[PDB]
Amino acid sequence: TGLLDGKRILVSGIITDSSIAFHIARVAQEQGAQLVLTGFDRLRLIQRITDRLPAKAPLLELDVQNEEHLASLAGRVTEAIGAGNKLDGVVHSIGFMPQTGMGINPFFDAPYADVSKGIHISAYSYASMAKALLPIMNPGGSIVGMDFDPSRAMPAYNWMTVAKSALESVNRFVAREAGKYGVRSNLVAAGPIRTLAMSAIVGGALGEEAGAQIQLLEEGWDQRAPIGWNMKDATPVAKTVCALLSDWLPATTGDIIYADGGAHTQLL
Amino acid sequence: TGLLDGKRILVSGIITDSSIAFHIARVAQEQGAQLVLTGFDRLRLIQRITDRLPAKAPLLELDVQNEEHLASLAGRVTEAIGAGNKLDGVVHSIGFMPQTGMGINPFFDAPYADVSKGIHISAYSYASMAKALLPIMNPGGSIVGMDFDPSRAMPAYNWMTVAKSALESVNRFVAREAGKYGVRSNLVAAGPIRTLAMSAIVGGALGEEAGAQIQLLEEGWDQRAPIGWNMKDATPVAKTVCALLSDWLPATTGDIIYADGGAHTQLL
Amino acid sequence: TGLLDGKRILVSGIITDSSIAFHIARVAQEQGAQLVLTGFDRLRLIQRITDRLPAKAPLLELDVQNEEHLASLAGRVTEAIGAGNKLDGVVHSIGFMPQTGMGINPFFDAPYADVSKGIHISAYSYASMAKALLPIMNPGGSIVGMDFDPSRAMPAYNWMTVAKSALESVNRFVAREAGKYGVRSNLVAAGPIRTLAMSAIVGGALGEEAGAQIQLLEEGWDQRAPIGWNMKDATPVAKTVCALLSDWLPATTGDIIYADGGAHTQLL
Amino acid sequence: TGLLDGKRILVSGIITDSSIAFHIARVAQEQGAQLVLTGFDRLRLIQRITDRLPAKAPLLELDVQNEEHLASLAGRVTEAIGAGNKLDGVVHSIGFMPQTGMGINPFFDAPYADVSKGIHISAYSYASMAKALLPIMNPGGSIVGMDFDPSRAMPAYNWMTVAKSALESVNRFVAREAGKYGVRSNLVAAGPIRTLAMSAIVGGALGEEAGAQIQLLEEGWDQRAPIGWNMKDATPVAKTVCALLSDWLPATTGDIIYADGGAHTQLL
Ligand SMILES: NC(=O)c1ccc[n+]([C@@H]2O[C@H](COP(=O)([O-])OP(=O)(O)OC[C@H]3O[C@@H](n4cnc5c(N)ncnc54)[C@H](O)[C@@H]3O)[C@@H](O)[C@H]2O)c1
Ligand SMILES: NC(=O)c1ccc[n+]([C@@H]2O[C@H](COP(=O)([O-])OP(=O)(O)OC[C@H]3O[C@@H](n4cnc5c(N)ncnc54)[C@H](O)[C@@H]3O)[C@@H](O)[C@H]2O)c1
Ligand SMILES: NC(=O)c1ccc[n+]([C@@H]2O[C@H](COP(=O)([O-])OP(=O)(O)OC[C@H]3O[C@@H](n4cnc5c(N)ncnc54)[C@H](O)[C@@H]3O)[C@@H](O)[C@H]2O)c1
Ligand SMILES: NC(=O)c1ccc[n+]([C@@H]2O[C@H](COP(=O)([O-])OP(=O)(O)OC[C@H]3O[C@@H](n4cnc5c(N)ncnc54)[C@H](O)[C@@H]3O)[C@@H](O)[C@H]2O)c1
Ligand SMILES: O=C(Nc1cc(Cl)cc(Cl)c1)[C@H]1CC(=O)N(C2CCCCC2)C1
């Protein structure tokens, strides 16, 4: 009776128990999905974290900047879910920008090598992952990535904003490719969520001014949101990702669904 | 195990078995919802049509231009669902524009009295219905209306486009009010669906040029849509409305969900 | 050497010396335009006000809700500018919403007759004026209307927001008609300008909460604007309207130009 | 009496007599601007081409991927225009994407090193150029870049679309920096212009299917445009850039002006 009963779904992006992807994985399992997880670099950590999920899920290594990892990924997934089985869903919950590209470091002072690394991981990899996994996805399947609305500039987010603008564009092209397989591609634009790192940035890890600006952003977001916004609760975001992974948004692709309390629809 | 198990939902807008609202009502009942229906003017017809739905549903009269109908509506709904029970969902699937405001009649030749009637029924009534029903809606509830993307002009749709632009604005304000009740408000922007009337317009009911332009629109829509678009199948639209009525998009309000095959994300 | 040398331009919307249209008219005359003015209801007042413009300009009566005024307008304009001469530009600087539709009166409590009057004057009349004047406009000509960005909801602006959403849609259709004459149609979306009435609303004319919200809006607008925003200075808006009336934006139509300090491009 | 009388403007991006920047430079000189030009790699060619401009203009070498060129640029400009003089305008008319990232090569088959080079030149360099030149720009000045509307996906444009989405984001952040200097930053989103290279792509240089799709795009663009679109005429685009360089859009920044015949406002 679960929303995702019988579905096989790959979830990337878990690194702590506060990762948005941890909550996506939890809700998906509560709703009957069978998962395969991917993790970057710290696999012992990630295994220990994902031991706390409701059900067992194989963990595979994936550095999206590593061409060998991407080239072997479909085979490794198929080994984990069984020959003759394919995926019904893929969750991209991956982002990175060097400190030069976010925070109080001036916008103009980010070297391109740093910006390029952030765009590789945060935007191009959405296409890389789709390339690798579409050949082992079933018709009716769904690829979902995580977005933070970049349509307006904001303090401190700087080149990560630019990376998210690129991601939104990439998603519209991935939809064209995915459609050939009967697969949808969409982003969920979430409101601000207090992951470990965000509390770190609020405590000043990227400069005092950036932390101050994020707290103002958070406060304004809840004010503007007609149904409010709880930055400590990723579950509403996770539910939205599961909606897109389900059979219930079958005519939506190349698109952005806003799980943000409605804040982006209100000026003040 | 239905998506809408236990939910009480009001559905407006059925007039034929090809009405988008007929399919919304059908899918909602398949998913366990208990419905109350509203109909305009031809109640004997509408009862005979809705006899074909999977389950029984009380039918109430509602002309959204009639202030007495709106003032009595909540009481009549409560009588139908039982004292002490409230609604969890409301579907607005209502639209109208006089022939002077659509088709081959020149854009400049639509008298304002005609445009005003179309905007009353197609846009203002979304607010009227929310005003009437929010006092008998439960927290966590959902109001959904039907949209046809008006962000660009198009042939023949003329003042109905303007009415839909107004509706989109109205929805953002209804979200502000609905949030006070813990209720969401959203639109579903559907691709073109061949209702009775649309085949009528294709057969030339509003002029030959308008019918020709609609057929070109339909053809282009399926071409652009990365997953295709079947104008003869309202079920994907109905499923999307049910997704918004469910618990699975809990952080989305004041917003527009596109159930259009992804066509609006592609230029060609 | 003026930007608008030799051009004949109709300017509507002057009612006080703080009207945005007064400043449009002033700047247009400084730049060599020959004007015809239209005014509503208080023609003795408007004549006394426009006596202060740099140059003489005939004043014609125009109530945009009056069909007889609209039907005679082109003939009256031609009489004022001389047989055989046509207009090169038209400025629509007209808006109205009854107090029930703006301010602290609840959104749901605005009667449709009031909303309909506001939409007639604020949105439909953009089409009415184009219908009346396109037959006496020269190729290369330009129609400009005034907008306040309605893409997100905001406190108190309420049904005027809805009217501006309608206007934006109307403009895209007027562009289709105007193009047949070689004429452009565009809106200028201005930041908040302290007209007489706005100081009145700040002093509480539409309720204390509305005045408080407008002051917060004004303050936020200047903060967000990368080049700042001076609500006491309409000249930057007037210059932008003159740019659209000129020969220098010849490939822009159906569009919106933002003269708002850049505020709409920034979240905070 | 020229629109840009007395203004000192840097124009990048000339490589042939069909370059959009060649036409920007020509119109700017016709309107009284004093120019400094920058060129990439083929300076003998570019000098011979720009000999045909109405007036003399110093040519400086600038490879935007070359950090030494960027670090010396302001000094070289100041030498060319005279100590104590500053720029009033900067035109970025620079774009590049390797063949793997455009045309018929599959979207998924573009290596990131190629995409990264295209984003460096086409998007990041807008920030690089602003960083280099803002210290020698006057208050009231204007930075303009060239855009091709990337809000929807399209055939063949592929990763260049993604680069333009990034550019639009970069422009909103450059506006924040430029505002500190009293300088505006905006993009002009042009319709398709038949430069040398575009005729090359139509003749099949990036594959037959891509050429076919571009011809369909061009045809549709003129159809949709309410005032038509002439792909052989860059002058309307050049005029629009000059409007933004002028004093007549003083409250517009972080924004996009569409010089596209109005096509983006029309669905069909
Ligand atoms: N936290 C928020 O406020 C917020 C808001 C909206 C969207 N998002 C997005 O949600 C997603 C998840 O972010 P989060 O806040 O949960 O943070 P997180 O740090 O928990 O997740 C980011 C993940 O990216 C992974 N990653 C980094 N480099 C990688 C590489 N080379 N290969 C593979 N994976 C790599 C990290 O290991 C980590 O698991 C990101 O796309 C982020 O931009 C976050
Ligand atoms: N058919 C499409 O291509 C399409 C596409 C997108 C959105 N829509 C929208 O979907 C909704 C339903 O349209 P449909 O195509 O199913 O057509 P339909 O004719 O079946 O439904 C329109 C309904 O509006 C009702 N209505 C008209 N005047 C009314 C009044 N005074 N009071 C109450 N109800 C009144 C009619 O009785 C009818 O039931 C409308 O909002 C329409 O604009 C339709
Ligand atoms: N003031 C701002 O903050 C602001 C911001 C953006 C846009 N605007 C828009 O600019 C325009 C001018 O507004 P303003 O602030 O200068 O106020 P204003 O009161 O000076 O101008 C409004 C004009 O509309 C006229 N009008 C009203 N009913 C009319 C009718 N029946 N026929 C003809 N004219 C009629 C009034 O006589 C008046 O001249 C309006 O469209 C307004 O919505 C204003
Ligand atoms: N042609 C169109 O249809 C069209 C439409 C909209 C926007 N645009 C944009 O207009 C701009 C100019 O394009 P165009 O069509 O005139 O083509 P073009 O080839 O004439 O201009 C592109 C320029 O970029 C320069 N460039 C490339 N690499 C460079 C580097 N490393 N450093 C400095 N300069 C470098 C080239 O030398 C050339 O002068 C580009 O941004 C393009 O994306 C073009
Ligand atoms: O960083 C975030 N918000 C934020 C940061 C700053 Cl410096 C300013 C603002 Cl306004 C918002 C949120 C949104 C986002 O994409 N992430 C990512 C999490 C993974 C590493 C890169 C950043 C966390």
Ligand SMILES: O=C(Nc1cc(Cl)cc(Cl)c1)[C@H]1CC(=O)N(C2CCCCC2)C1
């Ligand atoms: O009319 C429609 N499409 C359409 C019509 C025309 Cl004339 C042109 C175009 Cl492009 C599309 C579709 C979309 C829409 O809101 N309805 C409404 C159905 C109820 C009565 C008013 C119109 C049916």
Ligand SMILES: O=C(Nc1cc(Cl)cc(Cl)c1)[C@H]1CC(=O)N(C2CCCCC2)C1
């Ligand atoms: O009213 C205005 N701003 C405003 C009002 C309110 Cl109540 C709230 C907010 Cl946020 C902004 C500005 C913008 C606008 O269209 N006008 C119009 C001026 C003419 C009469 C109708 C209103 C003045």
Ligand SMILES: O=C(Nc1cc(Cl)cc(Cl)c1)[C@H]1CC(=O)N(C2CCCCC2)C1
């Ligand atoms: O390439 C163009 N259009 C185009 C190409 C393709 Cl392959 C498809 C489509 Cl739809 C449009 C136009 C738009 C654009 O940014 N340039 C750039 C010119 C300089 C080199 C990189 C491309 C030329």
